[PDB]
Design a protein around this ligand. Structure first.
Ligand SMILES: Nc1ncnc2c1ncn2[C@@H]1O[C@@H]2COP(=O)(O)O[C@H]3[C@@H](O)[C@H](n4cnc5c(N)ncnc54)O[C@@H]3COP(=O)(O)O[C@H]2[C@H]1O
Ligand SMILES: Nc1ncnc2c1ncn2[C@@H]1O[C@@H]2COP(=O)(O)O[C@H]3[C@@H](O)[C@H](n4cnc5c(N)ncnc54)O[C@@H]3COP(=O)(O)O[C@H]2[C@H]1O
Lengths: 132, 133
């Protein structure tokens, strides 16, 4: 229902490049402001999602949060790999069902090439539009 | 509408307390799994919202300076300008805020924190409507 024409194009999407370390990923997360962003390789294929909580949980020590380890771990060590996806817009009831539990959903082609995202905000804008 | 009945009760909402340091706030954020949560005082008054993004941005030097986490208080970085629900008389205002806020706190007239209203409850009704045709 014209969620297709609303998808946030991949090139406007903040992301972390695969292979980067967690120090770098924290920097990208902090600068862009977004709490969960996708992880891509140099061909812009989607491998996972990353957040600050994923990074911090991975450096929890027995006495302190071991930040010195941020340099040593890479984003693929801690990124989330099981996450829903959209391959086409012929099933946009699925998008809405999905958005109930996921702030955004990645859309990809058959080769898992990252096309962009659909966000809750897109839907809620339309809901507020039909009431007022 | 039924928006009132679907509020998440306060006892189910993770929060950090005033006066703690930024390291404490990170541990709570990381442990509870939510990325933005309220800041309450010892009487359950609502004072702010805090995320890891606010925390890390506050120690972002010229490199991130994690050593200052023990010296900064949550009230030094928490967000203090945010909307709140006082009543459920104007629920189309609640739909309007969810456009730009993943959740909105509801308070009583003394700013005691009573719970939150999340985008998720509106999205469920949307999904329900489409399932009925
Ligand atoms: N820089 C900004 N400008 C304006 N509003 C902002 C904003 N940052 C956050 N918000 C508001 O906060 C909501 C939650 O953002 P969060 O980063 O947790 O979660 C976001 C974020 O993780 C991801 N996302 C959205 N846009 C993105 C982008 N350009 N790049 C990367 N990720 C994005 O999708 C989730 C849902 O986004 P949605 O827009 O529905 O909902 C957003 C948006 O309504
Ligand atoms: N344990 C869990 N079980 C089921 N689903 C989970 C979950 N943790 C996260 N999610 C899903 O992820 C969405 C975004 O969560 P986030 O922590 O960014 O953003 C959350 C968080 O900042 C806050 N929030 C919601 N419930 C909370 C709670 N019990 N305590 C503290 N904050 C909460 O309101 C935002 C919107 O929450 P909403 O439920 O609309 O949307 C949630 C929820 O649908």
């Amino acid at each position: 229902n014209e969620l297709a024409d609303s998808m946030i194009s991949a090139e406007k999407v903040a992301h972390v490049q695969l292979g980067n370390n967690l120090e770098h990923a924290l920097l990208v997360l902090t600068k862009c402001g977004y709490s969960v962003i996708p992880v891509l390789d140099f061909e812009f294929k989607l491998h996972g999602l990353i957040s600050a909580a994923m990074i911090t949980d991975a450096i929890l020590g027995l006495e302190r949060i071991e930040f010195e380890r941020l340099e040593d771990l890479k984003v693929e060590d801690v990124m989330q790999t099981d996450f829903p996806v959209i391959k086409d817009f012929n099933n946009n009831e699925r998008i809405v069902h999905l958005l109930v539990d996921h702030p955004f959903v990645c859309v990809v082609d058959s080769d898992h090439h990252f096309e962009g995202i659909v966000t809750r905000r897109v839907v809620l804008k339309q809901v507020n539009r039909y009431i007022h």
